[PDB]
Amino acid sequence: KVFGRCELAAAMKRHGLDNYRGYSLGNWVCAAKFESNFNTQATNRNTDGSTDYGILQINSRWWCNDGRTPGSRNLCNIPCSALLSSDITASVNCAKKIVSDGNGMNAWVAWRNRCKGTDVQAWIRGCRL
Numbered sequence: 001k002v003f004g005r006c007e008l009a010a011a012m013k014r015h016g017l018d019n020y021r022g023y024s025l026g027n028w029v030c031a032a033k034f035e036s037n038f039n040t041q042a043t044n045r046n047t048d049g050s051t052d053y054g055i056l057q058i059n060s061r062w063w064c065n066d067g068r069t070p071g072s073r074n075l076c077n078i079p080c081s082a083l084l085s086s087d088i089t090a091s092v093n094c095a096k097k098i099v100s101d102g103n104g105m106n107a108w109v110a111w112r113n114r115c116k117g118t119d120v121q122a123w124i125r126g127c128r129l
């Protein structure tokens with residue numbers, strides 16, 4: 001599923017991401033925009049053989065099991081395919097674990113390079129929230 005901007009903002013708010021670990025909602029919408037272009041089915045293969053999955057491009061080396069990432073951990077206790085669902089619950093719950101790791105949202109390269117330090121509130125302006 002390809003989310004609309006405000007549709008995704010409302011779903012993330014319902015699942016408790018607004019101000020989670022201090023990151024306002026616009027940070028999460030901005031991250032999803034540049035990680036996946038709002039597409040729950042996005043996948044991207046990395047040079048180390050791991051793959052990034054879903055709207056927040058969660059990585060199979062640490063967070064989910066895809067059966068082909070040797071020596072990988074499954075810290076979110078989910079098959080990576082669950083992160084491609086039109087229902088974002090699994091992605092949100094796993095993202096909450098990731099952002100609680102030491103580096104916060106710096107774990108997402110696109111957030112660090114394209115959202116951090118910008119007017120991220122613009123990503124939710126005009127939305128009925």
Ligand SMILES: [Cl-]
Nearest residue numbers: 024025026121
């Ligand atoms: Cl915001």
Ligand SMILES: [Cl-]
Nearest residue numbers: 021103104105
């Ligand atoms: Cl933080």
Ligand code: NA
Nearest residue numbers: 064065072073
């Ligand atoms: Na794994």
Ligand SMILES: [Tb+3]
Nearest residue numbers: 100101102103
């Ligand atoms: Tb530690």
Ligand SMILES: [Tb+3]
Nearest residue numbers: 100101102103
């Ligand atoms: Tb440690």
